[PDB]
């Protein structure tokens, strides 16, 4: 698996509604999914496999 760094971003997932991607699993730990639009993060990493 590989990892990526996320910096200098405006994280709005609503653009994903404009695409054609559907997620069968989406679960967050430590945060409610409804509080991701009014919150700011410090260091974001993304692992994919």
């Amino acid at each position: 698996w590989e990892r990526m760094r996320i910096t200098n971003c405006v994280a709005d997932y609503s653009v994903l509604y404009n695409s054609s991607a559907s997620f069968s699993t989406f679960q967050c730990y430590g945060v409610s999914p409804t509080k991701l639009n009014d919150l700011c993060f410090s260091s974001v990493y993304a692992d994919y496999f």
Binding site: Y13, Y17, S22, S24, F26, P33, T34, L36
Partner: protein, 49 residues
């Protein structure tokens, strides 16, 4: 009638297309949610969101 990958969005404190723009539930929700597959009945009709 929901897409099938959006059955998980019919729950309190959720996010997505359905939870934001189509059908919401309160955080303090009391009740039950029931779902089942109807591929043999609803696959030849028009449904929107």
């Amino acid at each position: 009638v929901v897409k099938g990958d959006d059955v998980r969005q019919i729950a309190p404190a959720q996010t997505g297309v359905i939870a934001d723009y189509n059908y919401k539930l309160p955080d303090d929700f009391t009740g039950c949610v029931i779902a089942w597959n109807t591929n043999s009945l609803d696959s030849s009709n028009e449904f929107f969101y």
